[PDB]
């Protein structure tokens, strides 16, 4: 999966550790652009062990890759909203400074269903849904910006078991959509297996 082919928001169900690593390697290795990975996780589970095996930090061509991966542990929607603010600042300033090389940001979020759950228990269902909505719609507008100096694309990881609506549509009792299904139906452009 090349950056240029990514949709504004893409769901990636249960990626293997090797596939995640290769995706990161291929994209951050692109010449003539600065590609960065912001990995935002509720469980602090970036596969560091596999990544170091496939992309050894001891090899010269790999130094910049490690320098352009940013890691964050994010426990709730309020923290994710703050991270989105920071990303928009980075993008906005890059665009401005670009006339005062091109920046390509991949925002990769794992465990969004647990951030949502956490927020929901600290606030309300209504507030969590409004914060989720506000953050996703903002990331779409950000990714949709025609500007060529700086771009963002968002990838959302979910376990396949939270996307049964998708797999069974191929071709079970259920009490409403999982967060993954909700996003699949209402916020994401596509889902990549």
């Amino acid at each position: 999966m090349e950056y240029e082919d990514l949709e504004l928001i893409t769901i990636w169900p249960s990626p293997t550790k090797n596939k995640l690593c290769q995706f990161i390697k291929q994209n951050l290795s692109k010449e003539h652009v600065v590609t960065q990975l912001f990995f935002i996780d509720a469980t602090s589970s970036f596969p560091l062990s596999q990544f170091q095996k496939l992309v050894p930090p001891t090899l010269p061509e790999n130094v910049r890759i490690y320098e352009n991966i940013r890691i964050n542990t994010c426990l709730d929607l309020e923290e994710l909203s703050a991270i989105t603010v920071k990303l928009l600042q980075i993008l906005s300033m890059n665009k401005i400074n670009a006339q005062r090389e091109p920046l390509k940001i991949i925002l990769y979020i794992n465990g969004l269903e647990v951030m949502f759950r956490n927020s929901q228990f600290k606030s309300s269902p209504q507030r969590s849904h409004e914060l989720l909505r506000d953050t996703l719609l903002k990331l779409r507008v950000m990714g949709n910006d025609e500007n060529e100096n700086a771009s963002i694309r968002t990838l959302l990881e979910f376990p396949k078991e939270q996307l049964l609506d998708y797999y069974l549509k191929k071709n079970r009792i259920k009490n409403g959509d999982s967060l993954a299904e909700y996003i699949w139906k209402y916020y994401a452009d596509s889902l990549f297996e």
Binding site: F116, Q126, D177
Partner: protein, 211 residues
């Protein structure tokens, strides 16, 4: 004698307003006379992306005609999706109802200034405004905000002559994740009462039905 009214026929076949042309997929829903006077259409559908019928309703221009698409969902204005007869508003200043109302009030007051925010030469006729998706704008506060929204859209139709098409999701969207939030859509009558035609799309066969 003083009160006698004699009208030229050309009055009855001429209008200062644009009307919506229903595609074949939506014909047979309303009268003949009713389709002739469609100014406000609301569509309820589960699709995040626009259904084929909605696509046909838009991208219906010819020559200098343009449709203003207020793209709250960032779909229509995506580079691979843009069409020649559309003008797009896709801005962080217009993804909530307060910002939306501010923009539409400017469009009414000073179309040129509003349209400049959509990066538009002004050699064209504005035929229609589309808003996608109203469900993302969701106590008695929303009844008032939506009434204000409808009132400004109606003023815009009166002044500019554009038709108005809006979309929302069905009630199932309003149930929320795992039903934690628990017409077949959740918009106030304050808005729905103003529609000339309300259409509901229920899907493996998609069926368009009038409400």
């Amino acid at each position: 004698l003083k009160n006698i009214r004699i009208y030229p026929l050309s009055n009855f076949i001429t209008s200062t307003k644009n009307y919506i042309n229903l595609p074949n997929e939506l014909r047979n829903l309303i009268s003949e006379e009713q389709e002739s006077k469609l100014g406000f259409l609301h569509i309820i559908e589960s699709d995040f992306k626009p259904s084929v019928a909605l696509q046909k309703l838009v991208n219906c221009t010819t020559g200098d005609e343009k449709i203003l698409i207020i793209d709250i969902v960032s779909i229509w204005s995506q580079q691979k999706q843009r069409q020649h007869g559309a003008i797009y508003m896709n801005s962080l200043s217009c993804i909530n109802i307060t910002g939306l109302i501010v923009f539409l009030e400017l469009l009414y007051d000073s179309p040129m200034d509003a349209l400049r925010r959509c990066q538009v030469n002004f050699n064209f006729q504005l035929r229609g405004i589309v808003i996608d998706n109203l469900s993302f704008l969701n106590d008695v506060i929303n009844l008032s905000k939506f009434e204000k929204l409808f009132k400004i859209l109606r003023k815009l139709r009166e002044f500019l002559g554009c038709w108005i098409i809006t979309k929302s999701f069905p009630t199932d969207f309003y149930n929320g994740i795992e039903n934690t939030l628990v017409y077949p859509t959740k918009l106030p009558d304050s808005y729905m009462k103003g529609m000339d035609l309300i259409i509901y799309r229920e899907v493996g066969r998609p069926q368009y039905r009038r409400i």
